[PDB]
């Protein structure tokens, strides 16, 4: 005689996950650098039109 018992805990309703993402709180830390006009890279045309990925 060989028994094969399957224990049942309870009846649960699991939630099927689909789209997920990691998020949280963030506080930006700004760094100022006031450069004079015609001093290295500080200009009237290159200070205005400045790219964010450079």
């Amino acid at each position: 005689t060989k028994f094969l018992k399957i224990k049942t805990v309870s009846s649960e309703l699991s939630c099927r996950e689909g789209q997920s993402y990691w998020t949280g709180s963030f506080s930006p830390k700004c760094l100022s650098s006031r450069r004079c006009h015609l001093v290295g890279e500080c200009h009237v045309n290159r200070c205005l039109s400045w790219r964010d990925n450079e």
């Binding site: 830390k29 760094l31 100022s32 650098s33 006031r34 004079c36 290295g40």
Partner: protein, 301 residues
Amino acid sequence: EDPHLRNRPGKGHNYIDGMTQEDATCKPVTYAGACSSFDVLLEKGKFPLFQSYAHHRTLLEAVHDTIIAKADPPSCDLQSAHGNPCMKEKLVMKTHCPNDYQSAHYLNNDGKMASVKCPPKYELTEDCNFCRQMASLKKGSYPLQDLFCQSSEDDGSKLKTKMKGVCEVGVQALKKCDGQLSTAHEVVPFAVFKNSKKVYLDKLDLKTEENLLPDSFVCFEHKGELKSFDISQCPKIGGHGSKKCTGDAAFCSAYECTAQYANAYCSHANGSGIVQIQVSGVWKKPLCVGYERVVVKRELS
């Protein structure tokens, strides 16, 4: 836009007290000469901070101008006794010094200055933490930190490291550690005031405040182009002087201009003057502000 990166105000001395070997080519430091402690400061891809702020002074010039003091000993020899104070502050630093260099100066913790020394013929390595054996060997020193000197006398000895969540950064034993402490080499800002400790930073707010100062004008000698010429020989407004001098509105507003009746052309340096700092919400004036890559111990847990 002025290519006056070689003209040094004040006096123009870059050789340090302790390795006076290259004093025959860097005295005075001008457009000529091949000083090993100034050529790497303008190369593209090394110290861009000094490239942006080059019309002021350096740490060596600050030492020669009685601004930054020197530790005891100022040049700790690496091959002498068994223990020297200039080692715990050197092993924690991670830099990259080129080959064919004998000495390597850096900033200490007590606000003074302490460098190393290797007897001939020893050269540095890829990191500079130890001098091994052997173009020719340069008889100078390599700047280990990206900082710049300036003329200032602002007092600030009542300030310490302003870093939160940091166990022991560099050699400073701040707070204790009870959990997981990091050790990754990360860049950290710092600013040492007059007669103070190696005060670190967290938020930097640089600015440009120019002023009519004698150590803020550059010029080159004219002759039958960039030539060396001393600025101290420029007459004042109706005063006296040896030779002649001339310039624009900035140079002629404080000095005497003779137009074509001179031997040089003094021009106002871009950005030279007074560079202040904003620490703890109070505007201050540092001495040798810069960056360094030391061992930062951050408490993660």
